C-alpha cells in the first residue's frame, strides 16, 4: 500500500543541452510498521540507461515522513528530441542502517509528453 507524494521541478535548457531535475521534497509518507519514521532518500535514473552514469541519489534525511532535499541534478548531452522515448524514474527508498533499504514508491515521467518549464509539480507515489 503506497502512499505519499513527491514535489519535482523539471526544466530543459537548450543552450547547454541539459535536462535539469530538482527534487524539492516529499510529503505524506507512511510510518514503518514499527511506528518508527522513515529515513527517505531518492534515486533518479534517466532510462533506458541503468549504469552509474544515469544514477543520481539525494542525501538521506533522518526520521521523517516529510523529507526535504532541495536537490538539483543535471543530465547533459541531450537535445530536447533526445528525451522522446526516455523515462525519468524517481524512486523513494527508506534507509535501513542494518539491512536492505525498503522501497517506498516511485514517480515515472514520460518526458516526451512533459513541458519541462521548471514549474514545481506534485506527483502521486506509485
Backbone as JSON Lines, residues from 0, in Angstrom:
{"i":0,"aa":"X","n":[0.82,-1.22,0.0],"ca":[0.0,0.0,0.0],"c":[0.86,1.28,0.0]}
{"i":1,"aa":"X","n":[1.15,1.8,-1.19],"ca":[1.97,3.01,-1.31],"c":[1.15,4.29,-1.11]}
{"i":2,"aa":"X","n":[1.68,5.21,-0.3],"ca":[1.04,6.5,-0.04],"c":[2.07,7.63,0.06]}
{"i":3,"aa":"X","n":[1.62,8.86,-0.2],"ca":[2.53,9.99,-0.22],"c":[2.75,10.53,-1.62]}
{"i":4,"aa":"X","n":[3.38,11.7,-1.71],"ca":[3.61,12.34,-3.0],"c":[4.91,13.12,-2.98]}
{"i":5,"aa":"X","n":[5.42,13.41,-4.17],"ca":[6.74,13.97,-4.34],"c":[6.6,15.28,-5.11]}
{"i":6,"aa":"X","n":[7.4,16.28,-4.76],"ca":[7.36,17.57,-5.48],"c":[8.62,17.7,-6.31]}
{"i":7,"aa":"X","n":[8.46,17.82,-7.62],"ca":[9.6,17.81,-8.56],"c":[9.52,19.02,-9.46]}
{"i":8,"aa":"X","n":[10.67,19.56,-9.87],"ca":[10.73,20.56,-10.93],"c":[11.57,19.98,-12.06]}
{"i":9,"aa":"X","n":[11.07,20.06,-13.28],"ca":[11.81,19.58,-14.44],"c":[11.97,20.71,-15.43]}
{"i":10,"aa":"X","n":[13.22,21.02,-15.8],"ca":[13.49,22.04,-16.79],"c":[14.37,21.48,-17.89]}
{"i":11,"aa":"X","n":[14.28,22.05,-19.09],"ca":[15.23,21.7,-20.12],"c":[15.85,22.96,-20.69]}
{"i":12,"aa":"X","n":[17.18,23.03,-20.69],"ca":[17.86,24.21,-21.23],"c":[18.55,23.91,-22.56]}
{"i":13,"aa":"X","n":[18.0,24.43,-23.65],"ca":[18.55,24.17,-24.98],"c":[19.92,24.78,-25.18]}
{"i":14,"aa":"X","n":[20.27,25.77,-24.36],"ca":[21.54,26.46,-24.53],"c":[22.72,25.67,-23.99]}
{"i":15,"aa":"X","n":[22.44,24.7,-23.13],"ca":[23.5,23.86,-22.57],"c":[23.25,22.37,-22.81]}
{"i":16,"aa":"X","n":[22.15,22.06,-23.48],"ca":[21.72,20.67,-23.74],"c":[21.58,19.87,-22.45]}
{"i":17,"aa":"X","n":[20.89,20.43,-21.47],"ca":[20.79,19.79,-20.16],"c":[19.35,19.63,-19.74]}
{"i":18,"aa":"X","n":[19.04,18.45,-19.22],"ca":[17.77,18.23,-18.54],"c":[18.06,18.54,-17.08]}
{"i":19,"aa":"X","n":[17.26,19.41,-16.47],"ca":[17.51,19.79,-15.07],"c":[16.37,19.27,-14.19]}
{"i":20,"aa":"X","n":[16.74,18.52,-13.15],"ca":[15.78,17.83,-12.3],"c":[15.98,18.26,-10.86]}
{"i":21,"aa":"X","n":[14.94,18.83,-10.24],"ca":[15.03,19.21,-8.83],"c":[14.02,18.44,-8.0]}
{"i":22,"aa":"X","n":[14.52,17.68,-7.02],"ca":[13.65,17.03,-6.05],"c":[13.52,17.95,-4.85]}
{"i":23,"aa":"X","n":[12.36,18.57,-4.71],"ca":[12.18,19.56,-3.66],"c":[11.97,18.86,-2.33]}
{"i":24,"aa":"X","n":[10.9,18.07,-2.26],"ca":[10.53,17.41,-1.02],"c":[9.53,16.32,-1.33]}
{"i":25,"aa":"X","n":[9.15,15.58,-0.3],"ca":[8.07,14.6,-0.39],"c":[7.24,14.79,0.85]}
{"i":26,"aa":"X","n":[5.97,14.39,0.79],"ca":[5.08,14.6,1.92],"c":[4.12,13.43,2.05]}
{"i":27,"aa":"X","n":[3.6,13.19,3.25],"ca":[2.55,12.2,3.44],"c":[3.01,10.76,3.4]}
{"i":28,"aa":"X","n":[4.31,10.53,3.56],"ca":[4.81,9.16,3.59],"c":[4.28,8.42,4.81]}
{"i":29,"aa":"X","n":[4.12,7.11,4.69],"ca":[3.67,6.3,5.81],"c":[4.79,6.16,6.83]}
{"i":30,"aa":"X","n":[4.42,5.81,8.05],"ca":[5.39,5.34,9.04],"c":[5.74,3.89,8.71]}
{"i":31,"aa":"X","n":[6.79,3.38,9.34],"ca":[7.07,1.95,9.25],"c":[6.05,1.21,10.12]}
{"i":32,"aa":"X","n":[5.93,-0.1,9.93],"ca":[5.05,-0.93,10.74],"c":[5.38,-0.76,12.21]}
{"i":33,"aa":"X","n":[6.68,-0.71,12.49],"ca":[7.18,-0.49,13.84],"c":[6.56,0.75,14.46]}
{"i":34,"aa":"X","n":[6.27,1.75,13.62],"ca":[5.73,3.01,14.08],"c":[6.82,4.07,14.01]}
{"i":35,"aa":"X","n":[8.03,3.61,13.72],"ca":[9.17,4.49,13.53],"c":[8.98,5.26,12.24]}
{"i":36,"aa":"X","n":[9.57,6.45,12.17],"ca":[9.54,7.24,10.95],"c":[10.54,6.69,9.97]}
{"i":37,"aa":"X","n":[10.45,7.15,8.74],"ca":[11.36,6.66,7.73],"c":[12.59,7.55,7.63]}
{"i":38,"aa":"X","n":[13.58,7.07,6.89],"ca":[14.78,7.83,6.58],"c":[14.92,7.85,5.08]}
{"i":39,"aa":"X","n":[14.14,8.73,4.43],"ca":[13.95,8.75,2.98],"c":[15.1,9.37,2.18]}
{"i":40,"aa":"X","n":[15.44,8.73,1.06],"ca":[16.31,9.32,0.03],"c":[15.74,8.9,-1.29]}
{"i":41,"aa":"X","n":[16.17,9.57,-2.35],"ca":[15.63,9.25,-3.66],"c":[16.73,8.88,-4.61]}
{"i":42,"aa":"X","n":[16.42,7.99,-5.54],"ca":[17.34,7.67,-6.6],"c":[16.67,8.09,-7.89]}
{"i":43,"aa":"X","n":[17.46,8.6,-8.84],"ca":[16.89,9.04,-10.11],"c":[17.69,8.4,-11.23]}
{"i":44,"aa":"X","n":[17.0,7.88,-12.24],"ca":[17.68,7.35,-13.43],"c":[17.05,7.97,-14.64]}
{"i":45,"aa":"X","n":[17.85,8.21,-15.68],"ca":[17.25,8.61,-16.97],"c":[17.28,7.39,-17.86]}
{"i":46,"aa":"X","n":[16.16,6.67,-17.91],"ca":[16.1,5.38,-18.6],"c":[16.02,5.59,-20.11]}
{"i":47,"aa":"X","n":[16.47,4.59,-20.92],"ca":[16.88,3.21,-20.62],"c":[18.22,3.01,-19.89]}
{"i":48,"aa":"X","n":[19.1,4.0,-19.87],"ca":[20.43,3.81,-19.26],"c":[20.35,3.5,-17.76]}
{"i":49,"aa":"X","n":[20.89,2.35,-17.34],"ca":[20.88,1.98,-15.92],"c":[22.27,1.92,-15.27]}
{"i":50,"aa":"X","n":[23.27,2.46,-15.96],"ca":[24.65,2.41,-15.47],"c":[24.85,3.5,-14.42]}
{"i":51,"aa":"X","n":[26.02,3.51,-13.78],"ca":[26.37,4.55,-12.81],"c":[26.2,5.95,-13.42]}
{"i":52,"aa":"X","n":[26.33,6.02,-14.74],"ca":[26.28,7.28,-15.48],"c":[24.93,7.98,-15.37]}
{"i":53,"aa":"X","n":[23.86,7.19,-15.3],"ca":[22.5,7.7,-15.28],"c":[22.01,7.93,-13.85]}
{"i":54,"aa":"X","n":[22.65,7.24,-12.91],"ca":[22.25,7.29,-11.5],"c":[22.52,8.61,-10.79]}
{"i":55,"aa":"X","n":[21.51,9.09,-10.06],"ca":[21.7,10.21,-9.13],"c":[21.06,9.8,-7.81]}
{"i":56,"aa":"X","n":[21.53,10.37,-6.71],"ca":[20.98,9.98,-5.41],"c":[20.98,11.19,-4.49]}
{"i":57,"aa":"X","n":[19.88,11.43,-3.78],"ca":[19.81,12.56,-2.85],"c":[20.48,12.17,-1.55]}
{"i":58,"aa":"X","n":[20.74,13.15,-0.7],"ca":[21.14,12.83,0.65],"c":[19.97,12.16,1.37]}
{"i":59,"aa":"X","n":[20.28,11.47,2.45],"ca":[19.27,10.81,3.25],"c":[18.87,11.77,4.36]}
{"i":60,"aa":"X","n":[17.57,11.95,4.55],"ca":[17.06,12.76,5.67],"c":[16.58,11.84,6.8]}
{"i":61,"aa":"X","n":[16.96,12.14,8.03],"ca":[16.65,11.25,9.14],"c":[15.24,11.36,9.7]}
{"i":62,"aa":"X","n":[14.66,10.2,10.03],"ca":[13.41,10.07,10.8],"c":[12.32,11.11,10.49]}
{"i":63,"aa":"X","n":[11.64,10.95,9.36],"ca":[10.64,11.93,8.94],"c":[9.7,11.36,7.87]}
{"i":64,"aa":"X","n":[8.46,11.84,7.86],"ca":[7.54,11.49,6.78],"c":[7.4,12.63,5.79]}
{"i":65,"aa":"X","n":[8.15,13.71,6.03],"ca":[8.12,14.89,5.17],"c":[9.54,15.33,4.81]}
{"i":66,"aa":"X","n":[10.28,14.48,4.08],"ca":[11.68,14.83,3.78],"c":[11.79,16.03,2.83]}
{"i":67,"aa":"X","n":[12.73,16.92,3.09],"ca":[13.04,17.99,2.14],"c":[14.5,17.88,1.71]}
{"i":68,"aa":"X","n":[14.74,17.88,0.41],"ca":[16.11,17.76,-0.1],"c":[16.59,19.05,-0.77]}
{"i":69,"aa":"X","n":[15.71,19.7,-1.54],"ca":[16.09,20.84,-2.35],"c":[17.27,20.54,-3.25]}
{"i":70,"aa":"X","n":[17.29,19.34,-3.83],"ca":[18.46,18.83,-4.54],"c":[18.28,18.84,-6.06]}
{"i":71,"aa":"X","n":[19.22,19.46,-6.77],"ca":[19.14,19.56,-8.23],"c":[20.16,18.64,-8.9]}
{"i":72,"aa":"X","n":[19.71,17.91,-9.93],"ca":[20.6,17.04,-10.69],"c":[20.56,17.47,-12.14]}
{"i":73,"aa":"X","n":[21.65,17.25,-12.87],"ca":[21.72,17.67,-14.26],"c":[22.1,16.49,-15.15]}
{"i":74,"aa":"X","n":[21.39,16.32,-16.26],"ca":[21.74,15.32,-17.26],"c":[22.16,16.05,-18.52]}
{"i":75,"aa":"X","n":[23.37,15.8,-18.99],"ca":[23.96,16.58,-20.08],"c":[23.95,15.86,-21.43]}
{"i":76,"aa":"X","n":[24.28,16.59,-22.49],"ca":[24.39,15.99,-23.82],"c":[23.07,15.56,-24.44]}
{"i":77,"aa":"X","n":[22.02,16.35,-24.2],"ca":[20.67,15.99,-24.66],"c":[19.99,17.1,-25.46]}
{"i":78,"aa":"X","n":[19.56,16.8,-26.69],"ca":[18.65,17.71,-27.39],"c":[17.27,17.44,-26.82]}
{"i":79,"aa":"X","n":[16.37,18.4,-26.93],"ca":[15.0,18.16,-26.47],"c":[14.45,16.86,-27.08]}
{"i":80,"aa":"X","n":[14.67,16.65,-28.38],"ca":[14.06,15.49,-29.04],"c":[14.66,14.17,-28.55]}
{"i":81,"aa":"X","n":[15.87,14.23,-27.99],"ca":[16.51,13.04,-27.44],"c":[15.78,12.52,-26.21]}
{"i":82,"aa":"X","n":[14.89,13.34,-25.66],"ca":[14.16,12.94,-24.46],"c":[12.96,12.08,-24.84]}
{"i":83,"aa":"X","n":[12.6,12.09,-26.12],"ca":[11.43,11.34,-26.55],"c":[11.75,9.87,-26.49]}
{"i":84,"aa":"X","n":[10.95,9.12,-25.74],"ca":[11.17,7.69,-25.61],"c":[11.95,7.36,-24.34]}
{"i":85,"aa":"X","n":[12.52,8.39,-23.71],"ca":[13.16,8.18,-22.41],"c":[12.22,8.42,-21.24]}
{"i":86,"aa":"X","n":[12.57,7.86,-20.09],"ca":[11.74,7.98,-18.89],"c":[12.6,8.49,-17.76]}
{"i":87,"aa":"X","n":[12.08,9.45,-16.99],"ca":[12.77,9.81,-15.75],"c":[12.14,8.98,-14.63]}
{"i":88,"aa":"X","n":[12.94,8.14,-13.98],"ca":[12.42,7.22,-12.97],"c":[12.97,7.68,-11.64]}
{"i":89,"aa":"X","n":[12.09,8.17,-10.77],"ca":[12.48,8.65,-9.45],"c":[11.91,7.67,-8.44]}
{"i":90,"aa":"X","n":[12.78,7.07,-7.64],"ca":[12.33,6.08,-6.68],"c":[12.7,6.52,-5.27]}
{"i":91,"aa":"X","n":[11.73,6.46,-4.35],"ca":[11.99,6.76,-2.94],"c":[12.28,5.48,-2.18]}
{"i":92,"aa":"X","n":[13.26,5.56,-1.29],"ca":[13.74,4.43,-0.51],"c":[13.86,4.82,0.94]}
{"i":93,"aa":"X","n":[13.67,3.85,1.84],"ca":[13.73,4.1,3.27],"c":[15.06,3.53,3.7]}
{"i":94,"aa":"X","n":[15.99,4.39,4.1],"ca":[17.3,3.91,4.52],"c":[17.22,3.11,5.82]}
{"i":95,"aa":"X","n":[17.62,1.84,5.73],"ca":[17.66,0.94,6.86],"c":[19.13,0.67,7.17]}
{"i":96,"aa":"X","n":[19.58,1.03,8.37],"ca":[21.02,1.05,8.63],"c":[21.64,-0.34,8.57]}
{"i":97,"aa":"X","n":[20.94,-1.35,9.09],"ca":[21.49,-2.7,9.14],"c":[20.82,-3.71,8.23]}
{"i":98,"aa":"X","n":[20.26,-3.23,7.12],"ca":[19.69,-4.15,6.17],"c":[19.39,-3.48,4.85]}
{"i":99,"aa":"X","n":[18.85,-4.25,3.92],"ca":[18.47,-3.69,2.63],"c":[17.45,-2.58,2.87]}
{"i":100,"aa":"X","n":[17.52,-1.54,2.05],"ca":[16.63,-0.4,2.18],"c":[15.29,-0.72,1.53]}
{"i":101,"aa":"X","n":[14.21,-0.16,2.07],"ca":[12.87,-0.54,1.65],"c":[12.34,0.43,0.62]}
{"i":102,"aa":"X","n":[11.71,-0.11,-0.41],"ca":[11.08,0.68,-1.46],"c":[9.86,1.43,-0.9]}
{"i":103,"aa":"X","n":[9.78,2.73,-1.13],"ca":[8.64,3.5,-0.63],"c":[7.64,3.77,-1.76]}
{"i":104,"aa":"X","n":[8.15,4.08,-2.94],"ca":[7.3,4.46,-4.05],"c":[8.1,5.1,-5.16]}
{"i":105,"aa":"X","n":[7.46,5.31,-6.31],"ca":[8.18,5.8,-7.47],"c":[7.3,6.77,-8.24]}
{"i":106,"aa":"X","n":[7.96,7.65,-8.99],"ca":[7.29,8.53,-9.92],"c":[8.05,8.35,-11.21]}
{"i":107,"aa":"X","n":[7.34,8.0,-12.27],"ca":[7.99,7.79,-13.55],"c":[7.42,8.78,-14.54]}
{"i":108,"aa":"X","n":[8.31,9.57,-15.14],"ca":[7.84,10.61,-16.05],"c":[8.16,10.28,-17.5]}
{"i":109,"aa":"X","n":[7.13,10.3,-18.36],"ca":[7.3,10.12,-19.8],"c":[7.69,11.47,-20.4]}
{"i":110,"aa":"X","n":[8.98,11.69,-20.61],"ca":[9.48,13.02,-20.93],"c":[8.97,13.54,-22.26]}
{"i":111,"aa":"X","n":[8.58,12.64,-23.14],"ca":[8.11,13.03,-24.46],"c":[6.87,13.92,-24.34]}
{"i":112,"aa":"X","n":[6.1,13.71,-23.28],"ca":[4.84,14.42,-23.08],"c":[4.89,15.48,-21.97]}
{"i":113,"aa":"X","n":[6.09,15.8,-21.5],"ca":[6.25,16.84,-20.47],"c":[6.7,18.19,-21.06]}
{"i":114,"aa":"X","n":[6.24,19.29,-20.44],"ca":[6.52,20.65,-20.92],"c":[7.92,21.12,-20.55]}
{"i":115,"aa":"X","n":[8.4,20.68,-19.39],"ca":[9.76,20.97,-18.92],"c":[10.04,22.46,-18.72]}
{"i":116,"aa":"X","n":[9.22,23.1,-17.88],"ca":[9.32,24.54,-17.68],"c":[9.8,24.92,-16.27]}
{"i":117,"aa":"X","n":[10.34,23.95,-15.54],"ca":[10.83,24.17,-14.18],"c":[9.75,24.6,-13.19]}
{"i":118,"aa":"X","n":[8.49,24.32,-13.52],"ca":[7.38,24.54,-12.6],"c":[7.45,23.41,-11.58]}
{"i":119,"aa":"X","n":[7.29,23.74,-10.3],"ca":[7.14,22.71,-9.27],"c":[5.8,22.02,-9.45]}
{"i":120,"aa":"X","n":[5.81,20.69,-9.46],"ca":[4.58,19.92,-9.61],"c":[4.56,18.78,-8.61]}
{"i":121,"aa":"X","n":[3.37,18.3,-8.24],"ca":[3.26,17.19,-7.31],"c":[2.85,15.9,-8.0]}
{"i":122,"aa":"X","n":[3.53,14.81,-7.66],"ca":[3.25,13.52,-8.27],"c":[2.97,12.47,-7.22]}
{"i":123,"aa":"X","n":[1.89,11.72,-7.43],"ca":[1.49,10.68,-6.5],"c":[2.51,9.55,-6.57]}
{"i":124,"aa":"X","n":[3.01,9.1,-5.42],"ca":[3.93,7.97,-5.44],"c":[3.15,6.73,-5.87]}
{"i":125,"aa":"X","n":[3.76,5.89,-6.7],"ca":[3.09,4.69,-7.21],"c":[3.83,3.44,-6.76]}
